[PDB]
């Protein structure tokens, strides 16, 4: 006995338009922003640790560790200038999530990304759990000050190669991303404890589910809740080495998990098409892209 009448994208679409599916949680990772030109900052193929010789770090990872950053922030900000995107244009996937919001289906979007594209696409603070923080805002690091600065201010400092200092107290100003050694956001744990009591559908897009504790969110869904993965590669299955709550797409025991393998944009397009939303999504994307291109 299962909520999906078949373990396919078509089964998921029929379930979404049934009275049983009211509340959708999206879990998204780097795979939803690669088509916007944003690289996967956790992939070794990105080479974040490769050309740091001129910074004389005690070890490669120090560039992203909070205690090192606070005393030697220049390497991080030099790297941030080199990797700073040329444009912030959200993808079809981001705008699919905006449509979910528009239609009253979006309970929450948990994101591993720091690129701000969920916000640009129209998800509001209350819709989002930025599990690793964001570049959208930055804060003075002094506990007694904590002056907030917008991304436009931070970008100007990064591009002029001036280490960002607080105008009120002259302390370092840090983008609101979670550095290694920093606490994960309290909001991540608070929202998880409430949201997963309420979820009817998990949409997992563009994440290989390899980074904890984000990956463990799939095990927080009720046992009946269908879980759709839209991703270039299958992910989330229990590790035959390591291994509880893993994806089961393909066994005779499979009952609720569905994998659609391909580009995230094409998967969301296909799902929107099944839902009758394709024209709405095309119109939204073309309009928002036109607006961003015209800034």
């Amino acid at each position: 006995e299962r909520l999906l009448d078949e373990l396919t994208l078509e089964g998921v679409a029929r379930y979404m338009q049934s009275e049983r599916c009211r509340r959708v949680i999206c879990l998204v990772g780097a795979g939803i922003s690669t088509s916007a030109g944003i690289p996967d900052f956790r992939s070794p193929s990105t080479g974040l640790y490769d050309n740091l010789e001129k910074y004389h770090l005690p070890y490669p990872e120090a560039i992203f560790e909070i205690s090192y950053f606070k005393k030697h922030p220049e390497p991080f900000f030099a790297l941030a200038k080199e990797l700073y995107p040329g444009q912030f244009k959200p993808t079809i996937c981001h705008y699919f999530m905006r449509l979910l919001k528009d239609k009253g289906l979006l309970l929450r979007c948990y994101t591993q990304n720091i690129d701000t594209l969920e916000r640009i696409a129209g998800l509001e603070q209350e819709d989002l759990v930025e599990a690793h923080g964001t570049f959208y805002t930055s804060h003075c690091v002094s506990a007694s000050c904590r002056h907030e600065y917008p991304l436009s201010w931070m970008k100007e400092k990064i591009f002029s190669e001036v280490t960002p200092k607080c105008e009120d107290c002259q302390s370092l100003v840090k983008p609101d991303i979670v550095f290694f050694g920093e606490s994960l956001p309290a909001r991540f744990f608070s929202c998880m404890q409430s949201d997963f009591l309420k979820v009817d559908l998990l949409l997992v897009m563009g994440t290989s589910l390899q980074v904890q504790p984000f990956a463990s969110l799939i095990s927080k869904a009720p046992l009946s809740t269908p879980r759709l993965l839209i991703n270039k590669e299958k992910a989330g299955q229990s590790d035959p080495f390591l291994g509880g709550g893993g994806m089961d797409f393909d066994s005779k025991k499979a009952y609720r998990d569905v994998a659609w393998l391909g580009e995230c944009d094409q998967g969301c397009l296909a799902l929107a098409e099944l839902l009758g939303w394709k024209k709405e999504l095309e119109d939204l994307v073309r309009r928002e892209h036109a607006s961003i291109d015209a800034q």
Binding site: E61, H132, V178, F179, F180, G181, E182, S183, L184, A186, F189, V211, Q212, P213
Partner: peptide, 7 residues
């Protein structure tokens, strides 16, 4: 609160 690590 749990701190951010490699894993």
């Amino acid at each position: 609160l749990p701190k951010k690590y490699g894993g």
